Structures are given as structure tokens and as C-alpha cells.
Amino acid sequence: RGLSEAKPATPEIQEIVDKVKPQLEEKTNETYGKLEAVQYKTQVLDTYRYILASTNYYIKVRAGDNKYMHLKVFRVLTGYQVDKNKDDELTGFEN
């Protein structure tokens, strides 16, 4: 269950964070206007050869000025860490 290398984020990662934002807000009881999705890492759990599914995303989202969060999305939000800084490496954590 090794983690991928830190890759720059893409529009699909941005849409992933946009679609899991309601779950994040329901879990934190706080509304977020924009999550910029700075970077992301991937974690393969089972086998899907080319690419379709069976993966965990660890996305560093920028919520605001000096306000970053780390999201763990399976697309169901399985985890999150609040109050992270820009240079914090994305690491795996229990859900």
C-alpha cells in the first residue's frame, strides 16, 4: 500500500474535491467557498489494469489564506486533516 509521488493537481482532481466538498462540510459543520486542490497522491488498493477505479486519493486542498486541508477520498470522503501548512507532505492516515 505504498503512496504515489507528489504530483501537481489537474482539473479532474479539482472536480473530485468539488464533489466531495458537501461531505467535508457535513462532517465539519463549516462551509468552504473554494478548495483549490494544490497537489495529490494516489494509492492503489486492488487491481484495475488501465485506469478506472479502486484507488485512494490524498489531495492537499487550499481552503484560504494560509488555510490548507488534506482530504482522503475513496467518491466517498474517508478522511481529512484540518489546519495543515503549504509545505506539509501528503501522508497516509487511518480513516
Author numbering: 4 to 77, 93 to 113
Show the paper's wording:
Here we have used an SQT variant, named SQT-1C, with AU1 and Myc peptides inserted into loops L1 and L2, respectively, as a model to understand the effect of inserted peptides on scaffold structure, stability and oligomerisation properties. We show that inserted peptide regions play a crucial role in scaffold protein oligomerisation via domain swapping, leading to significantly different conformations and surface exposure of these binding epitopes in monomeric, dimeric and tetrameric forms.
SQT-1C crystallised only from the freshly-purified tetrameric fraction and in the presence of 19% dioxane, surprisingly yielding monomeric structure, which was solved to 2.5 Å resolution. X-ray crystallography confirmed that monomeric SQT-1C exhibits typical cystatin fold but only in very specific conditions, when crystallised in the presence of 19% dioxane. Interpretable electron density was observed for polypeptide regions R4-L48 and A93-N113 whilst residues D49-F75 were visible but less well ordered, indicating higher flexibility of this region. The SQT-1C monomer exhibits a cystatin-like architecture with five anti-parallel β-sheets and a perpendicular α-helix, showing that peptide insertions into loop regions do not affect the SQT scaffold backbone. SQT-1C oligomerisation state in solution under crystallisation conditions was further assessed by SEC, which revealed that in the presence of 19% dioxane SQT-1C is monomeric.
